[PDB]
C-alpha cells in the first residue's frame, strides 16, 4: 500500500471512548483531525471511527 502523511494530530494521554459513536484515542497516538472549532475536537483514529475527543487528552502535533 502506502503510508503518506495526512492532517494528523497526536494524543497526550489515553482516552477510552464510550462506544464507537465516540472517538477512542491512545497515549502518544496519532489521530486525524477534522473539526477543531469547538471544545471537543472531531477526529478519526486508526480504528477508522470518528467522534469527539477531550482537548485535555488530545492536542495538535507540534511537528
From Swiss-Prot:
Organism (species): Homo sapiens
UniProt subunit comment: Interacts (via SH2 domain and SH3 domain 2) with EGFR. Interacts with PAK1 and SOS1. Interacts (via SH3 domains) with PKN2. Associates with BLNK, PLCG1, VAV1 and NCK1 in a B-cell antigen receptor-dependent fashion. Interacts with SOCS7. This interaction is required for nuclear import. Part of a complex containing PPP1R15B, PP1 and NCK1. Interacts with RALGPS1. Interacts with CAV2 (tyrosine phosphorylated form). Interacts with ADAM15. Interacts with FASLG. Directly interacts with RASA1. Interacts with isoform 4 of MINK1. Interacts with FLT1 (tyrosine phosphorylated).
Signal peptide (UniProt feature, chain positions): none
Domain notes: Only the first and third SH3 domains seem to be involved in RASA1-binding; the second SH3 domain and the SH2 domains do not seem to be involved.
The protein's role, per its UniProt record: Adapter protein which associates with tyrosine-phosphorylated growth factor receptors, such as KDR and PDGFRB, or their cellular substrates. Maintains low levels of EIF2S1 phosphorylation by promoting its dephosphorylation by PP1. Plays a role in the DNA damage response, not in the detection of the damage by ATM/ATR, but for efficient activation of downstream effectors, such as that of CHEK2. Plays a role in ELK1-dependent transcriptional activation in response to activated Ras signaling. Modulates the activation of EIF2AK2/PKR by dsRNA.
PTM sites of type N-acetylalanine: 4
Positions of transmembrane segments: none
Subcellular location: Cytoplasm; Endoplasmic reticulum; Nucleus
Posttranslational mods: Phosphorylated on Ser and Tyr residues. Phosphorylated in response to activation of EGFR and FcERI. Phosphorylated by activated PDGFRB.
Protein name: SH2/SH3 adapter protein NCK1
Residues of the full protein shown: 1 to 61 of 377
SH3 domain segment(s): 4-63
Lineage per the UniProt record: Eukaryota, Metazoa, Chordata, Craniata, Vertebrata
Amino acid at each position: 500500500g502506502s503510508m503518506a502523511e495526512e492532517v494528523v494530530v497526536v494524543a497526550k494521554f489515553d482516552y477510552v471512548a464510550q462506544q464507537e459513536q465516540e472517538l477512542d484515542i491512545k497515549k502518544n497516538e496519532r489521530l486525524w483531525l477534522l473539526d477543531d472549532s469547538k471544545s471537543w475536537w472531531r477526529v478519526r483514529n486508526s480504528m477508522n471511527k470518528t467522534g469527539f475527543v477531550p482537548s485535555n487528552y488530545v492536542e495538535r502535533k507540534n511537528s
